Symmetry: none
Subunit: 509 residues, 4 copies
């Protein structure tokens, strides 16, 4: 079950990957989650067929497939790694790591996110080993332990490549650089000085090749320094260039550790920005390289200068009440009331790990959200809907230049699935209701849907083989966000958890 | 509108085109959807409308549809009612089963359930006849057939004039009350160790046909079980070549050409002109037969797949086995065709009634059978090896033969590398659907056999495709999983592997873009 | 992995089996456990070599192998049934019953004891099914349930053939006759009228073809009728011809259910019989067909008329104090003191399931025993040694004509292993100390020993292939009797439990 | 009497005949017991004295014996002291291991431990050097070598002039302090991904020999690890044919006949007359070599098993590989001999020093190696098949070649059907002991190769036979279990199976009737 090859992936390649491939977690290193491919447009997306599906191992499916040179690399729950013909669905090889039993939590935990570099596939194992497999055969190139004990420190977002260095987080409590050839540790940074869900940068890590900076976030666990903090570090040495705390007094497990994206924007924040918390009145206006996105579950969209971390603006998305205000320098003041009384949002967020996408060409950011609040208390659960809100699942389209909401669309069932932007002005998203849906980037209108065997829980991607654009997504398991459907009073949501699979769609052509 | 109607004999005898309420859509077992929205011209446009995850284990199931609901048997006797257009679960019955590997292993899959009144009927894994309320999945009646172990069911129960009837897999066939389940009769086989296959009720002649002493076909009355006629289709069987497979009752101008491919024997007398007929291939051997549906008079017989278990066939019903194929002492390469999974097996054939074309899923496959003395002592102990291989001039396993039932002549035959081992579905738009061991779900032209469209399921495409209608839209549905005996046939492919994924169990439903 | 054959076993064959075969549990149907083979004698037994061994499944090994026509039939723990070339140790076939989990209790419970009849091997499964396999292929001929529920009623001694009928006990609470071709039940007898270890005839059942009577015992659970009772029934109908209670007021779980043997003897009981409890003074003297042996753990040796159950004599073996006296008709009076105070023997007996043997030619009975008592209370356990007794393991040789002890030999380590008599005047026995030993029937002297990988826990047998006499025994697991070694103050006993195997020995020749 | 003596270098260099205190009985690794009580005349009388159950897993172990005690490594690093004459357990150390399948899989078996002072030494599965007290099994020292995962040990540590030394399986060889375990040196290989095999210390020349850049033999000083000489025995290796196998140091009148079977090359210059020598077959390939023990000057080289990985061999140490055997594109049947388990592997050879006869366990075995294009796209993906088969004219796998080390000529060669894959033991009574994949434990005549006696173990007879003495009685001991890679070779046997039982793990000890 082997291939040889080529086309060995350099740092230059990761910095300018082929339009038709998906070789970083967000396809480009600055993230975005945007396929520049254009065959599938709004006019024809309603014709999309299933080309092929393949069954995956049971467990939570949160995976972003990678495609290189016509090969799909697919991490299954339980550290089963597969390489599949990305046009036909024929298995090439499969590598099963021997585990087993009880570490950090119908089978496994997500190994969602892998990296390609040189001729290796890299992932962090359920027991915290950095592991490199050969692309051609699935054979182990190296297996190195990052922990000591053993322990119960894990990792779910996975490693990324940053200028030859392999960088990875945790779920002790640090981010670490590693040698791409040996896997030996080059540096580690902890988050918190020396004197409640997941803890310690298990979110997505973003490398910008232009400024040569790696960006990661910490979680909670004075302001409680440096909890829930965004860090911009150099990749070879881990040195810290700039930081900023996005949520100080966190009593709600809001985990400011999700993907932030680096891009060029005309910085032109509007005072009519919805959910506006604060615009720095001393910041320049005009073209600028920027770090922007929603880092925390609480839903605040921020923009910083990428390089200096100069604060630009901050703004609400989902209704929330943990944050009383943010000043002119982006210092957050938490609502001490919550730390009468309806806490919004939840510990499953307005947002959570399911990633936002950015269309770089129009500068629209698309974030999958959930309208949900806590509660003092079909059958019963801890959550409830925010005031005057009908539906739970939501996607918000926001202009990263002005901060103005372009549109905002909802459906009853919880979302809790990533979105994928494409060059054809169409946006894909799954969801807790098993639906895989195509929306218009222009309007938010649904142009196409299918329905998967399970919750449409994983990251949609897009790639090309022989001129055909493909769109793929997995795949299933039990989703924390399907439990959000308890707040729905008018309908049960059929969140089937068994039947895991990856699915690949295409124009009939 | 949304009225959820009772199912009567009569609805069973005359189904609306949009429904699939008998195992084979009609009681006569054609497996033909008369719907036409999907044609040879547009089938290429088919989209996935919805899928839904099923329980793990092997999927050999034929869903039933009635008034917008899909009723679907999952392995482990989990029964589901699913909204047929959207995939919304309506209800799910999980029957408390004692323990797996206490029951018959061959009873893991459930192929068929029956609909009657407002109940769904299945025979459990622990050999009970169970009736669930269509509205809710709550138990209406649970009735023990007897278990003194490892006796279950495979192909499902049917309705025959207000009477529930099922086989078993190990001998039994029984008739039951449709409101109570009480046993009304019992016919004994002593294959005689199982009437496990599909049972076919003709509401015209009031005759029930099942397959078995040593492979005989039986025509019994549904009220009493009284044997009206019978016929032995493979006598000295030395290869588990059961003849319990679905036979079809149809009217057809019987004018059998003497040019039948694989012609074994027609007849002197005979008749011609027709004739309500039982026909099809009942054995694993792949021999196609024809009888008078009410007398069981022999009409004609032909070969489909290559075989050599049958020497000749006299003009009256026969059979005389080829002795060259029987392993009797010793140490020599025996070539036996086909295999224990045949060229043909449970995966059902379809017949298009309008065209008179019979569509049979096959496998080009043989084995070398050698028994070799281990040279132990004290004892003459032997090892016996069955290596599977392709027949004389075949590149490909897995095939569909379309055959005219009037002439007995072959319309077309198409192959592909991977084992098929999957049922076929005929629709009124001139398209034929078939699964396969390679995960692919394909639409074929009924005219030419050409592949017009395919998609690939997450698992082996192992269950029966059906078609139905909701609000004027035609859907095509199929499941969906597990490990298949058919997958093993691919070992005969030299070098190339076929990705027969077992995990990922699901039912899928396709339709034209609306 | 198959054979065909022949030599189909009739009732006539079971009644007069070949000297060189072992086709009933005790080789002949009347039990005895005696190989009429003569090659191995006292003069040459010291030369015995290992010919072959084969590994068995883990779990308790209590098995009596069967040999027919050069084939060994061997029941492994967990209902794994093997047929092995009995001269070479080559596996022919193996049948694994699919079980699993928790029923009546390093893997399985003993399926010790199987029967051969016609061309089938019969056993009762761990979940109480009567199961018939073809001798040639290991294929299931029939599998029928004897219970209803399911339950927790099991069986460990196994079925026997009695004139075409298959008879079997339990561990609800009855003995049952079954059809040899279909396995359907023909009759069942319960033990106890309608108004604490194992309960309900899980001991060995004895069929006499001469009187056509089946003999079985009940366990405990007024005299408490009919507890701990010996029953003589007809095989086709189960009808009860005679009975006798061997231990009425049982508060010690003494289980009068072990093998009793049917033989012709010159009835000539001596008043100088050791441990003498009672001789019926009204019973005839002279040649007579008799039922004799030790049915209960408490060690009393009885003799009855086989046919009428007329009581002949009763006599102690191991020291005991549960029984105050037995009258002239064999009615037992229990010592109400125990029901100050050292209760002898134990619940693991003087005797337990490990079987006695009888040499029919000299009329000596050989019983493996254990000198052990309870206690009011190396490390610690519930047991202790009886007054003035040094060693735990013991074998007693008793004349069944006079009741007089011929000899009695002991060793420190607990015995708890069956004995096998042979025609060459040598007696085999294993033990809790891993030793497999050959004793002189004349003297009790040890003439030969080897040492097995594990406790020598199973029944030794003997058979012939091509003129060579073979002696075989298994095999291991955790033995209840190895726990008896706690009462040893001067030495630990190395009772290795892992390494299960059957072993076959022979003269070098 | 019962004095339990300390082991010094010197006792190690000059073992009493009755003891087995170095992996191969003597430091020079002959695996020869000089005891004579057991002879070719009476070995047929051998009785089982005692056995004892071992932990499950694969048994490749060589027990050590000293002053009446057997020290025995069980899989899972359970270490036992057993009374050597009776089988009474004395003590058992169970090391708390983190979790299986976190450690190197190839480290499951432990072949060797070392004795020194009053401690037993082993390298753990988790790559620690551990010293246990001979008296008790209590831990004296536990020292971590480094683990950054899946690095363990296989063949055991040795003593070399007060220095503990071991390889690994993935590169490392290291020297340690005998009282503390502290690392005293480290030699790096970058097979170079493992010096996993047996390591041979010569106390005469003070030289340690292990097998590896690309398969070279190394002679290092025990104090410092300083490489004194080296030699590459298989350069362009394309078949995992490691050369880490035991080589032997012996004095031998070097007069190599030019009639050596499988003669590759002798020499012009050379010397003759002898010479303390390193010799034996170091590769899986089965090529027998000879060097000066102190210079590593090349002397001669021959073939044992059939092979074609080696083309030719120049008169100076060579090697030049046959290119016909390297799989380079495509679609053709490659015949490569031997296999990845060779004709030779870890199972050790024995040398009788008095007779100068070298006794090597082999396997007549080859494979057909074909790579076939799957015709995927996009990608050129291949399947690669290794079917195992017998060599040109062989009926039998599994063999012992006895070869004279002075002449290089073959004394005898005997075979049997089943794979061997088991070490050999030479004794001073002129008998050779060998296990096997067929469970049989056999004594051979060193004179003729004839089988003089056998018994059958409960499992594959997979570990090394040794011999020792207690109170004047000679014992022969061997274990004892698990699943063997060698068992797979039997697939090349057509029809006949060999009963390679994996469960039943044990050590057995035999002796003459007393
Ligand atoms: Ca069958
Ligand atoms: Ca290696």
């Amino acid at each position: 079950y082997f291939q040889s090859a080529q086309t060995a992936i350099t740092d230059e390649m990761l910095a300018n990957p082929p339009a038709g491939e998906w070789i970083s977690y967000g396809q480009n290193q600055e993230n975005y989650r945007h396929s520049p491919l254009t065959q599938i447009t709004t006019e024809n997306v309603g014709q999309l067929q299933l080309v092929w599906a393949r069954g995956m191992q049971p467990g939570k499916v949160q995976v972003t497939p990678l495609i290189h040179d016509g090969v799909m690399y697919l991490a299954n729950p339980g550290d089963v790694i597969q390489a599949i013909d990305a046009k036909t669905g024929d298995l090439i090889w499969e590598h099963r790591r021997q585990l087993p039993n009880i570490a950090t939590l119908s089978f496994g935990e997500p190994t969602r996110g892998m990296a390609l570099y040189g001729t290796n596939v890299y992932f962090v194992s359920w027991d915290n080993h950095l592991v490199a497999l050969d692309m051609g055969t699935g054979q182990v190139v190296f297996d190195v332990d990052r922990g000591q004990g053993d322990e119960r420190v894990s990792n779910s977002s996975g490693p990324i490549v940053a200028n030859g260095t392999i960088v990875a987080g945790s779920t002790g409590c640090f981010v670490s650089g590693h040698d791409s050839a040996t896997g030996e540790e080059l540096w580690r940074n902890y988050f918190i000085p020396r004197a409640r869900w997941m803890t310690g940068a298990w979110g997505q890590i973003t490398y910008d090749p232009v400024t040569n900076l790696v960006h990661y976030g910490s979680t909670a666990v004075g302001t409680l320094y440096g909890t829930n903090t965004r860090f911009a570090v150099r990749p070879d040495t881990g040195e810290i260039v700039w930081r900023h705390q996005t949520l100080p007094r966190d009593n709600w497990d809001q985990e400011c550790t999700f993907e932030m994206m680096v891009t060029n924007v005309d910085v032109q924040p509007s005072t009519e920005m919805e959910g506006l918390q604060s615009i720095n009145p001393n910041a320049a206006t005009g073209e600028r390289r920027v770090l922007t996105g929603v880092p925390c579950k609480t839903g605040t969209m921020w923009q910083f200068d990428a390089e200096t971390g100069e604060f630009l603006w901050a703004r609400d998305t989902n209704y929330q009440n943990m944050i009383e205000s943010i000043d002119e320098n982006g210092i957050v003041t938490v609502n001490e009331d919550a730390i009468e009384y309806d806490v919004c949002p939840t510990f499953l967020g307005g947002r959570d790990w399911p990633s936002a996408a950015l269309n770089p060409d129009s500068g629209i950011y698309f974030i999958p959200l959930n309208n949900v609040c806590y509660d003092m208390m079909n059958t019963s659960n801890v959550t409830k809907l925010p005031p005057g809100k009908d539906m739970i699942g939501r996607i918000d389209a926001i202009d990263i230049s002005t901060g103005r909401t372009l549109w905002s669309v909802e459906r009853a069932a919880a979302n809790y699935s990533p979105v994928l932007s494409t060059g054809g002005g169409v946006l894909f998203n799954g969801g807790t209701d098993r639906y895989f849906r195509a929306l218009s980037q222009e309007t938010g209108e649904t142009l196409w849907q299918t329905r998967l065997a399970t919750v449409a829980s994983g990251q949609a991607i897009s790639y090309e083989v022989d001129g055909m654009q493909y769109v793929a997504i997995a795949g299933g398991g039990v989703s924390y966000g399907s439990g959000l459907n308890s707040a729905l009073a008018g309908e049960r949501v059929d969140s089937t958890a068994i039947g895991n699979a990856v699915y690949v769609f295409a124009l009939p052509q």
